[PDB]
Design a protein around this nucleic acid. Structure first.
Ligand SMILES: [Mg+2]
Ligand SMILES: [Mg+2]
Ligand SMILES: [Mg+2]
Ligand SMILES: [Mg+2]
Ligand SMILES: [Mg+2]
Ligand SMILES: [Mg+2]
Ligand SMILES: [Mg+2]
Ligand SMILES: [Mg+2]
Ligand SMILES: [Mg+2]
Ligand SMILES: [Mg+2]
Ligand SMILES: [Mg+2]
Ligand SMILES: [Mg+2]
Ligand SMILES: [Mg+2]
Ligand SMILES: [Mg+2]
Ligand SMILES: [Mg+2]
Ligand SMILES: [Mg+2]
Ligand SMILES: [Mg+2]
Ligand SMILES: [Mg+2]
Ligand SMILES: [Mg+2]
Ligand SMILES: [Mg+2]
Ligand SMILES: [Mg+2]
Ligand SMILES: [Mg+2]
Ligand SMILES: [Mg+2]
Ligand SMILES: [Mg+2]
Ligand SMILES: [Mg+2]
Ligand SMILES: [Mg+2]
Ligand SMILES: [Mg+2]
Ligand SMILES: [Mg+2]
Ligand SMILES: [Mg+2]
Ligand SMILES: [Mg+2]
Ligand SMILES: [Mg+2]
Ligand SMILES: [Mg+2]
Ligand SMILES: [Mg+2]
Ligand SMILES: [Mg+2]
Ligand SMILES: [Mg+2]
Ligand SMILES: [Mg+2]
Ligand SMILES: [Mg+2]
Ligand SMILES: [Mg+2]
Ligand SMILES: [Mg+2]
Ligand SMILES: [Mg+2]
Ligand SMILES: [Mg+2]
Ligand SMILES: [Mg+2]
Ligand SMILES: [Mg+2]
Ligand SMILES: [Mg+2]
Ligand SMILES: [Mg+2]
Ligand SMILES: [Mg+2]
Ligand SMILES: [Mg+2]
Ligand SMILES: [Mg+2]
Ligand SMILES: [Mg+2]
Ligand SMILES: [Mg+2]
Ligand SMILES: [Mg+2]
Lengths: 150, 128, 138
RNA sequence: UAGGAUAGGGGCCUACCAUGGUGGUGACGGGUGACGGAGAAUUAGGGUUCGAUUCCGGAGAGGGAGCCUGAGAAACGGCUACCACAUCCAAGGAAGGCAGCAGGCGCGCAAAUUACCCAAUCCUGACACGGGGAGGUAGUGACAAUAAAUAACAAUACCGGGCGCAUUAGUGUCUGGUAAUUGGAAUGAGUACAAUCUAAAUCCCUUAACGAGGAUCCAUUGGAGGGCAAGUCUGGUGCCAGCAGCCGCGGUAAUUCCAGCUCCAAUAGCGUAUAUUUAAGUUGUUGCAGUUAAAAAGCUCGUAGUUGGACCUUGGGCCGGCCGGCAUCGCGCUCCUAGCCCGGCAUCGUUACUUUGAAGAAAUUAGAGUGCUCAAAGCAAGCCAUCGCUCUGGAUACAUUAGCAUGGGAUAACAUCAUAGGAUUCCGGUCCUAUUGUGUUGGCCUUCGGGAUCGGAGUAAUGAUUAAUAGGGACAGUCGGGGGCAUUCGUAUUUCAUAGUCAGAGGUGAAAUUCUUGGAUUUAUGAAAGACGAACAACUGCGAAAGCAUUUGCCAAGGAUGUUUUCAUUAAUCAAGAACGAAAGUUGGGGGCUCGAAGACGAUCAGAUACCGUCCUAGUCUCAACCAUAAACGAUGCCGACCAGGGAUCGGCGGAUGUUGCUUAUAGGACUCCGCCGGCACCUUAUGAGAAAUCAAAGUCUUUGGGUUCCGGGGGGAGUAUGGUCGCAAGGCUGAAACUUAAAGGAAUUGA
RNA sequence: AGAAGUCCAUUGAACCUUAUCAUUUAGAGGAAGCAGAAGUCGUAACAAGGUUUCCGUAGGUGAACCUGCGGAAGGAUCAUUG
RNA sequence: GCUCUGAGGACUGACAGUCGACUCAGAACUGGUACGGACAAGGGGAAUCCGACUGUUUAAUUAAAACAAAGCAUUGCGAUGGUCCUCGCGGAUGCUGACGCAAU
RNA sequence: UCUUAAGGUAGCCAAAUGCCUCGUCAUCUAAUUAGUGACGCGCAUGAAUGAAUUAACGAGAUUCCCACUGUCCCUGUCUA
């Protein structure tokens, strides 16, 4: 279950069977490459990109329309995340926690939470460094962490 | 975590010891299908339908209630074709029936087939 | 429960090695103290009698079990040693050479005798059974 | 690196340079009553213990060190020196080394001959020829192992059961026993002419005359309450002596002691003692246990360790009686093996697994053959017309691992194609070697062969498995007494002040200490201080556990749910390491309401250091810093799967009409019905489990294996001594042994 | 060629001072545990054991023990819709 | 002591030219085993008692265990006040104010 | 049981505090009124008159040991 708390929930997305896009999705894959690149150049990460297509422009799945995932479109056009998405978000979270905690020295439960967040950053960074998506000596320096995000 | 071929074998044991007619197995495998084939071929379960929609997969087996037990010896040992014979006594109810299913380089297959083809392997499980 | 991993042979051998020590018999044999015991890893042990003493018997019984304090000539220890049979104690005498055997129960005191682990089977090199059964007198 | 030295590599040594090597996969050190191995015991399988020893390898000659002779020695049945020990001495000096055979001292529980011989096996010499305490033989030998005597057969007899009838007899058949009963048979233990054996004697195997009357040619060792097979026999003893491995016997009717008769067990053996194997599934890999019996770390994070989801053609087959060989939609072959244009050919990922093979020292282990008489053995031996030699054997098996090799390629690791620096028949350019056209050696060079580089055209289906009822992350509305900082609020208590009023009040079962006409208690009003957050408050929520209840705000975080978002194995549990950790406690500021260890009093009591009451210190509260334990409890580690039923309830979500003291009308919110998740639980039931109480998870276990961590091995001693280490201190973490003991303990049943 | 002697080297016993490690053994006194025997004093615990039991911590007491603060039930309550 | 070896730099145009006062390693040879050769220059250890330490003290017999000390504690005082001086008027602490003054 | 306002608690000791006294036991010694470690009916120890310890320090008081020396045995001699 949930790694850093004993919750055991199973809520998630369940993708429809038909890999082929539904009829009313007549979207032109060149035009959705334009849409992705416009949304990414707008500063935005793949999660929000996928949300905007799902909700605004009615694109069920980028891979059902195009056959190419959001990240691999962005990599092909050179707009990828320089820090991979979820590691980015974990670093942003830990910077926020630590900025609060330097003002509240007696908030021990957030000392625990920050230890958990940095544990999680380090596990995910170990993975990315074995998969060659980060430089092999990229190290999460808590001091020089606030620049790299937000 | 999972070590399926257990999620499945203990599911069929539970279902059959209770007396259910059809059991469904949430993960599948080449090992699962090749294992159930050994059971069916030796005549212990009837047919089974493999729901492969698009995911890990799913199986539903239709039991005859004629199987009595099946187990996975996770901790898959190694097994030469001479100590086939001191497992067949070690795990099985007798020297007559019951089969030990050993993965061998000629696919997943039971121990008498293994002796006839003169190969060893690694024990996956057994049933009787 | 158990570690049944295939690559955990080291873990299980080390576990059995560390836990074989909480067994009393193994710890007793492989800790070495049999070699600080009075026989120091001996079957019997010859010695000299210092005095025939006589020691009471534990509570359910009531007696004067006739023991002899002997000294071991191999290592200088002094111990007590029962003289088993009816009247047979008299054949023992102070500064007679006696072989101290085990009294039974493998190094632990036996019967109603408090704190005695040793029996006398020979005195002056003559069988103590032989003097009891008047076969061969010293 | 350079060199020296050695037979030779080498830090084996030197000079110079570099600072490396090893280590939680246990280095280094410490113990070993440790030479290593082949192997020995026990063994259902797995294992446990042992291995001085005759075969192999090493080491050593009292302890070390150094050497000559020699092919070979750092040799000791050779020397040189020192240390220990000791011998002869004519007093100057000299000679030493039994862990060789034999023997003696000593040590010890514990170990034979100061014998004979080179005849066998082999070695050695100048050598058929000498020598061999190697070796063999004789002597002591209950180390262990083998075969195996101590009587057999008869009729008489008091008898004793069928069977001749069974009746009603009587005797009668296998001979069952007490028969020193009666009797003729047989024999070797022993003795002994010999012969044979032997290198010579001897043991044996053969055998002349001896050699048996059941007292003798004599069988014992341990028992007779249970475990454990066999005395409710008879005398003695009187909780004495004594037995008894454990339970127990013995205090005057002792089956247990001590004895006689009887019986039992094994029987040329049997007990005792210690070590050790089995028993022991009480060391549990196969194969234990952790709710309550011994035992889940307080809780979480966590590195190494261990473990890891699914997916990728051998998918249909001809073929001849398990496979050879074969097609489809088999990237190439020039080289060996290479067909009557042809199977089946090399180099351009690693292993683990398994198969077959090689090679594996003998003795041992199993196992074949063989009549040493059998046997344990041994490696012999068998028929000829047992007449001038035939037939011969002296097999095979195993050998765990590591290493070498062939084929298999399921299972699992390690490794890795999205920047295309990818693959691809071709084309020439950068440049080089050279062969038959250099009959001699050859040597730069023209189309040519090969590196290597190298640009462009070519073709290919041109190159990334899904998105786990795994995980992270994202977004949405929520939810919570989860956290921090600030903050409003509440009565009450205490003290005070103001006012009234007069004999009590407080306390208990009862009293007093106490307060009280200096007005106590009681009444009201106001103030101040500091703690606590009633009732709502639950088989309810939040939290990793500890824990968390007045209000509002800010701060950051979090589970669940919802999702046609994203990434794609990123995960589980975790020695080292790290965070939080109630109360008490310790240091120092702030506060000092109530309560209150200590302390003092008042009662009680035999006493009362206590229960009861009065006063009260530290403390109780906040802050800064420590501590690191609780019955830190669900006495139940964490992750995962399946299995039974139901209604409640908390959170979210989805679906339904039917009314609101709401709502510009619907929606929403409150309530009702249904259903999904996810919580804490709860109730009935075994078809389950278990020692049971009990448990729907403590279930899916002798039909035993999903992963992972920690931990227990009778009760004490003892969480003690010591050593270490953290702490200011109390303490915490780690943590024995001696010796003691036969029960301690769990669950339930009857009673009292 | 060659002896005695001698030189500079290398191996180096062996003796000696010190340090240090390990294995035994003495010690006035101090203080543990165990066991015995027919002892002294109490009543702590097992029933509501007459103050419910016990667990962490602090202090005190002849001894058992008491008391404070916090916890638990292994409690003498599975219960207030009465 | 003597003779050497090596290392450690500057300036000018990874090399060349010139310069460089000093320090540090190592070896040979040598002497009546003498070498910090004069000078200068700690004896060491095992324990007790006292005072924590540094400091000060009876000038001319006592240098100390005595005094001071940091640390701890106590007391008074909120200005019309506390401790103190003056014969008086007045003053010291006070150019001060409780984290202060004062007395032990 | 008398008695007090309270009966010297934690500690400590023949201590610079102990008359008895050269206390008793151990060690140091050939021999120790000394020293140290203990024992405590403490003439007359004892808690900020501060109790018990205590690393470093000390021209402080004591005791033993190693090296050292004319301090001594036991005196001699040289120089200003
Ligand atoms: Mg985890
Ligand atoms: Mg799940
Ligand atoms: Mg008993
Ligand atoms: Mg070299
Ligand atoms: Mg040895
Ligand atoms: Mg040998
Ligand atoms: Mg010797
Ligand atoms: Mg030698
Ligand atoms: Mg030698
Ligand atoms: Mg010799
Ligand atoms: Mg000998
Ligand atoms: Mg008897
Ligand atoms: Mg008898
Ligand atoms: Mg018996
Ligand atoms: Mg019997
Ligand atoms: Mg016996
Ligand atoms: Mg008996
Ligand atoms: Mg045991
Ligand atoms: Mg045992
Ligand atoms: Mg057990
Ligand atoms: Mg327990
Ligand atoms: Mg890890
Ligand atoms: Mg009034
Ligand atoms: Mg609530
Ligand atoms: Mg409230
Ligand atoms: Mg604990
Ligand atoms: Mg616990
Ligand atoms: Mg727990
Ligand atoms: Mg609900
Ligand atoms: Mg629900
Ligand atoms: Mg135990
Ligand atoms: Mg218990
Ligand atoms: Mg009970
Ligand atoms: Mg009581
Ligand atoms: Mg009580
Ligand atoms: Mg109770
Ligand atoms: Mg008290
Ligand atoms: Mg009190
Ligand atoms: Mg001073
Ligand atoms: Mg100074
Ligand atoms: Mg003076
Ligand atoms: Mg002076
Ligand atoms: Mg003034
Ligand atoms: Mg006293
Ligand atoms: Mg006084
Ligand atoms: Mg005194
Ligand atoms: Mg003296
Ligand atoms: Mg003294
Ligand atoms: Mg006094
Ligand atoms: Mg005084
Ligand atoms: Mg001084």
């Amino acid at each position: 279950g949930r790694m850093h708390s004993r919750g055991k929930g199973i809520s998630s997305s369940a993708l429809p069977y038909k890999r082929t896009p539904p009829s009313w999705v007549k979207t032109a894959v060149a035009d959705v490459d334009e849409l992705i690149t416009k949304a990414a150049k707008k500063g935005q990460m793949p999660s929000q990109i996928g949300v905007l297509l799902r909700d605004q422009h009615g694109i069920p799945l980028v891979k059902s329309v195009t056959g190419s995932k959001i990240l691999r479109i962005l990599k092909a056009h050179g707009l990828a995340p320089e820090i991979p998405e979820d590691l980015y978000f974990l670093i942003k979270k830990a910077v926020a926690i630590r900025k609060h905690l330097e003002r509240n020295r007696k908030d021990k439960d957030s000392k625990f939470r920050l230890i958990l967040v940095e544990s999680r950053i380090h596990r995910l960074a170990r993975y990315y460094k074995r998969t060659k998506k980060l430089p092999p000596t990229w190290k999460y320096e808590s001091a020089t962490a606030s620049t790299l995000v937000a | 975590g999972r070590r399926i071929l257990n999620d499945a074998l203990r599911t069929m044991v539970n279902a059959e010891r209770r007396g259910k007619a059809t059991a469904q197995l949430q993960p599948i495998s080449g090992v699962m299908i090749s294992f159930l084939n050994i059971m069916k071929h030796r005549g212990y379960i009837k047919n089974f339908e493999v729901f492969d929609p698009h995911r890990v997969g799913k199986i539903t087996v239709e039991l005859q209630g004629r199987i009595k037990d099946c187990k996975a010896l996770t901790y898959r040992q190694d097994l030469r074709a001479t100590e086939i014979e001191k497992y067949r006594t070690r795990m099985l109810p007798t020297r007559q029936w019951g089969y030990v299913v050993v993965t061998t380089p000629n696919g997943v297959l039971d121990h008498e087939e293994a002796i006839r083809q003169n190969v060893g392997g690694q024990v996956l499980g057994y049933f009787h | 429960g158990k570690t049944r991993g295939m690559g955990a042979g080291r873990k299980l051998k080390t576990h059995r090695r560390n836990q074989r020590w909480a067994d009393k018999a193994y710890k007793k044999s492989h800790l070495g103290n049999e070699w600080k015991k009075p026989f120091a890893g001996s079957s019997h042990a010859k010695g000299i009698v210092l005095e025939k003493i006589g020691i009471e018997a534990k509570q359910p019984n009531s007696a004067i079990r006739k023991c002899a304090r002997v000294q071991l000539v191999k290592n200088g220890k002094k111990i007590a040693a029962f003289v088993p049979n009816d009247g047979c104690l008299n054949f023992i005498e102070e500064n007679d050479e006696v072989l101290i055997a085990g009294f039974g129960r493998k190094g632990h005191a036996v019967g109603d005798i408090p704190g005695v682990r040793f029996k006398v089977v020979k005195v002056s090199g003559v069988s103590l059974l032989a003097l009891f059964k008047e076969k061969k007198e010293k």
